[PDB]
Design a protein around this ligand. Structure first.
Ligand SMILES: [K+]
Ligand SMILES: [Mg+2]
Ligand SMILES: [Mg+2]
Ligand SMILES: [Mg+2]
Ligand SMILES: [Mg+2]
Ligand SMILES: [Mg+2]
Ligand SMILES: [Mg+2]
Ligand SMILES: [Mg+2]
Ligand SMILES: [Mg+2]
Ligand code: NA
Lengths: 96, 170, 221, 148, 178
RNA sequence: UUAGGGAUAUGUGGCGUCAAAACUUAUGGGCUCAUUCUCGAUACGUGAAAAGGGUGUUGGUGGAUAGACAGUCCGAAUCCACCGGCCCCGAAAAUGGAUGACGCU
RNA sequence: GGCCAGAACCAGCCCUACUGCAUUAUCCUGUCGGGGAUCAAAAUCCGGCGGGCAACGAAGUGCAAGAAUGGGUCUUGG
RNA sequence: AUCGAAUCGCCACCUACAAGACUGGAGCUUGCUCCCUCGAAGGCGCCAAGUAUAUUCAUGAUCACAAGACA
């Protein structure tokens, strides 16, 4: 395997055209740590302080013919502890 | 019995492909696998070869000979009124509704959601009226079955005294 | 399985309601063993929680004698110097399905065993799964779309009962009781279903008209 | 005309003034607002989506975090000239339910004009209810296959 | 599906020389996936019948003979194939098809399936559209019945590729994983 | 055929799961049923099989006979020889075991 | 701020959409004859003669050079 | 009670059954004709308890785990 690219299967995305529609969309992997670490708006929104963390990526290209997508995360690769776990594929950036 | 046989003049619907959900007439049977399909009144349904796995036979069969001319097939289709009768059926309406939902905008989806919620609300109101009239729901069946026993149990003088005192204290 | 007193005390302290994870219940009746196993293994590797019922009604292509002989050939495989710790030949149909899926999984990694522990297999439909929601099928692994109907096929329960499975009759009696109970409960609630259908019919007239036309446009009224 | 000029813009035509837009991110994700104008220098869009209807105030939002639907409101009667980057500029801060009067009056006037425009429209009430609606992704939804 | 072989007419001759100032021009019809294979078969036939190599010849034209209008027809394909065990085996087979190219492609598939013959071991001697009353095999003549009717039994109908689902409710069209 | 790294395409080989790819593609045609080394899917790798045989099935080539063959007359095709494809018999060894596994019709 | 993100634009590069030119005849189409089958027919098929562009997105036939004057670049620099 | 978490569709209308060489129901002519509920939707849910006359949302200042979740 080459871990710098990840494969994401999205519900109801079962064709290469759908995965093409998703090319460029932001991708988030949400998990939690053991301690409460720094976050965006740590001072502005103290209600966001949590053990919950997120790793962000983007859809680079479709993979195969059945709606699978290739995702690259910002810098570091996504951990293998995320294999089989939930991935958030947002609708932005919007081209429509 | 039942089903609809593959024969000359049989109306069919295209299952998959770029002609999906279009209707043509079997004008000639090539072999076990393929037929010749044509349909006037439809621009894309010129005489072409279809695989029988891709057709859906319909309940209509215009009377026509194998390998019929365009004029003869068109006259037979017009006289039989097969397309009209098909357009009156619920499956054709479902196909049209699927096309409309495919082409729908966000505002049309909002309007559909509003209409479905309104029908749901009025169905709930009608159901509540009929359910109070006759106990068909779980809660109304439980209500009557326990209400008889409760009326029997609260007719006691001690029950009424305790009930009245505790209500007055409230 | 039985929760700890610590877990129950914590649930009471948190006060959260009953929680059930998202679980797909598959009715494996009249399903091809290998194809259903492949689909279920892929879905388990994708992180889904799957419970399969009526594993005694799975199908294998070929006559029952050929598949009995295949199973007996499997049963011949044992560690000669110590049959304990040798291959363990499970005779129950649900165990057979679990073994097939396990063979279609990376069973010697943490990921594969995580996938395998996400699968629960039953013979018949036990009471804890009867009322948990509508059961699913696998269209691409169903017998009426996979086998040419001329050819013979094996029902997994019939093979298992002759290769050593002991609970064929118990499962049959339980399924008879379950279907009798479910048929009784479905003959009842018929008044409720008819009442709801008539309620929707009358709502079609009691609702504002442009909504009715919108429903007619989208094939709903 | 020139990339140095404020009037320059590369915004897609769908995000036109008066178009109703689904807000994709931020505090008002899922809410439907009305695009009022675009700020100069190819800047962010400004949406109102009357705060009476869906609670969204006059607010900047990048066009990449909005889905501009094909439904539009003729908002030519709305005076979007007072909306300028100055009213969104914040004072510099020193070392360490609240709306300034100018912002509140701008929102009140803009919302009055926008409600007048929406109400004066064929399907005006349906569009008001549409703006009150909340957009969410349901289980089984395929937004990639939809028109907007 | 459209046939994988096209009907080519290759016209060629030996290159004019002093010894043979005006060589005979030969018209050759072949069924090939592309025109390069058509020229290859033409030059093989020229070599094996006229002792004319491609290195001493001209190809005047290599055109596709268009199909007629698609009509259910009986096609007689006279075809031969080679095997080491039997040598050259010639057979005449009738096919139902709508075109000569379709009939010949069907014949090639039939030879590949029933006799394990490959394209380059096969020579199509002739393909002709024949009337119904000249059809001898009942497996073809059964399609000449005026009231030819049959149902579609044991259908394996798959959903539209977008609509396909992995898990669906048992007596319902609601997709649970799709 | 090879400096340390990205991106995009391929080669050989593959796209049911293991395992990336047809979430088991086609709106492609035919053939095959194989009961205890369990049909087959083994280029090199012979790293397993033959002579011979089969009224299993599916093709071909010649010859014929047509109120024909069979049946006891009576209504339509029948018979003979030969050659292919796949399958089967031929086909017996020693720890439990290998189309890589599961399975697949 | 020599940190983390989003968007905008510029140059380069990488993908995609947008198509013309030749060809067709063993072809298309009327009519007469044959032949076929029918319940009668038409058709499948063969000749003669008379016209031709099968032009709907005509063909899955040969060649195409159509200035993205739409995406990606956390695959490059600003 | 540490404990901040990842998970994001509910249902006492699916949560009964069986068959795909097969009808919702008939007919005789057995593959066509005629009836019906016309044989391609499990019901809700997606911001007014319902389709209209409403009604607080900002400064959480342009994306950041939804800053919240008993539907
Ligand atoms: K004639
Ligand atoms: Mg080497
Ligand atoms: Mg895979
Ligand atoms: Mg090997
Ligand atoms: Mg070998
Ligand atoms: Mg032999
Ligand atoms: Mg094996
Ligand atoms: Mg292998
Ligand atoms: Mg959160
Ligand atoms: Na079937």
């Amino acid at each position: 395997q080459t871990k710098q690219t990840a494969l994401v299967r999205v519900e109801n995305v079962n064709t290469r055209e759908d995965a093409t529609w998703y090319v460029g969309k932001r991708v988030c992997y949400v998990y939690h740590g053991k301690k409460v670490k720094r976050c965006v708006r740590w001072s502005k929104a103290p209600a966001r302080r949590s053990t919950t963390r997120a790793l962000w990526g983007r859809v680079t290209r479709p993979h195969g013919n059945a709606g699978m997508m290739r995702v690259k995360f910002n810098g570091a690769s996504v951990p293998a502890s995320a294999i089989g776990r939930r991935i958030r594929v947002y609708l932005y950036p919007s081209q429509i | 019995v039942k089903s609809h046989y593959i024969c000359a003049g049989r109306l069919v619907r295209i299952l998959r492909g770029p002609r999906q959900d279009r209707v043509g007439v079997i004008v000639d049977i090539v072999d076990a696998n393929r037929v010749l399909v044509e349909n006037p009144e439809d621009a894309k349904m010129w005489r072409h070869v279809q695989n029988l796995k891709n057709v859906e036979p319909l309940k209509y069969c215009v009377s026509v000979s194998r390998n019929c001319s365009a004029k003869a097939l068109k006259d037979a289709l017009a006289s039989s009124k097969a397309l009209e009768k098909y357009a009156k059926t619920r499956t054709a309406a479902r196909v049209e509704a699927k096309k409309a939902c495919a082409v729908s905008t966000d505002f049309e989806r909002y309007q559909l959601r509003v209409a479905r919620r309104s029908r749901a609300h009025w169905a709930r109101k009608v159901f509540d009226e009929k359910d109070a009239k006759t106990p068909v729901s779980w809660h109304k069946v439980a209500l009557k079955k326990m209400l008889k026993k409760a009326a029997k149990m609260d007719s006691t003088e001690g029950a009424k005294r305790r009930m009245q005192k505790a209500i007055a204290a409230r | 399985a039985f929760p700890s007193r610590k877990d129950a005390f914590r649930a009471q302290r948190k006060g959260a309601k009953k929680h059930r994870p998202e679980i797909i219940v598959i009715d494996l009746k009249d399903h091809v063993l290998g194809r259903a196993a492949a689909v279920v293994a892929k879905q388990l590797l994708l992180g889904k929680k799957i419970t399969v019922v009526r594993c005694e009604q799975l199908n294998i292509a070929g006559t029952e004698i050929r598949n009995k002989i295949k199973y007996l050939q499997y049963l011949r495989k044992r560690k000669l110097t110590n049959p304990t710790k040798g291959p363990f030949h499970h005779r129950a149909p649900s165990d057979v399905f679990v073994r097939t899926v396990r063979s279609m999984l990376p069973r010697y990694t943490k990921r594969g065993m995580k996938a395998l522990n996400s699968l629960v297999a039953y013979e018949g439909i036990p009471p804890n799964v009867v009322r948990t929601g509508g059961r699913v099928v696998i269209p691409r692994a169903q017998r009426h779309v996979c086998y040419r109907s001329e050819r013979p096929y094996t029902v997994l329960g019939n093979m298992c009962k002759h290769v050593g499975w002991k609970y064929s009759d118990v499962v049959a009696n339980l399924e008879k009781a379950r279907v009798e109970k479910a048929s009784r409960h479905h003959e009842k609630q018929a008044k409720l279903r008819d009442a709801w259908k008539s309620a929707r019919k009358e709502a079609l007239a009691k609702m504002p008209k442009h909504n009715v036309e919108v429903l007619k446009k989208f094939g709903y009224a | 005309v020139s990339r140095k000029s404020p009037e320059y813009t590369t915004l897609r035509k769908s995000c036109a003034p008066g178009a109703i837009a689904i807000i994709l991110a931020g505090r008002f994700r899922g809410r439907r607002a009305v695009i009022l104008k675009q700020l100069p220098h190819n800047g962010p869009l400004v949406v109102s989506g009357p705060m009476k209807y869906n609670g969204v105030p006059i607010r900047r939002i990048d066009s990449r975090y909005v889905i501009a639907t094909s439904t539009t409101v003729d908002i030519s009667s709305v005076d979007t000239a007072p909306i300028t980057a100055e009213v969104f500029q914040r004072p510099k801060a020193e070392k360490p339910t609240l709306v300034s009067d100018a912002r509140a009056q701008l929102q009140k006037k803009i919302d009055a004009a926008l409600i007048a425009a929406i109400k004066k429209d064929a399907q005006g009430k349906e569009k008001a209810g549409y703006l009150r609606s909340v957009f969410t992704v349901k289980p089984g939804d395929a937004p990639h296959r939809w028109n907007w | 599906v459209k046939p994988h072989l096209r009907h080519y007419q290759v016209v060629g001759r030996e290159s004019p020389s002093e010894k043979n100032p005006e060589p005979t021009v030969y018209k050759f019809e072949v069924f090939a996936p592309n025109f390069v294979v058509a020229k290859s078969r033409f030059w093989r036939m020229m070599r094996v019948k006229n002792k004319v190599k491609a290195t001493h010849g001209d190809v005047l034209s290599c055109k596709v003979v268009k199909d007629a209008k698609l009509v259910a027809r009986n096609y007689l394909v006279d075809i031969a194939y080679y095997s080491q065990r039997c040598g050259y085996t010639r057979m005449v087979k009738e096919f139902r098809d709508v075109s000569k190219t379709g009939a010949v492609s069907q014949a090639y598939h039939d030879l590949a399936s029933r006799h394990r013959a490959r394209y380059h071991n096969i020579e199509v001697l002739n393909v002709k559209s024949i009337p119904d009353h000249e059809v001898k095999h009942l497996s073809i003549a059964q399609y000449h019945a005026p009231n030819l009717s049959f149902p579609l039994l044991q259908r394996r109908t798959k959903a539209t590729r977008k609509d396909r689902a992995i898990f669906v409710k048992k007596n319902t069209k609601r997709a649970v994983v799709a």
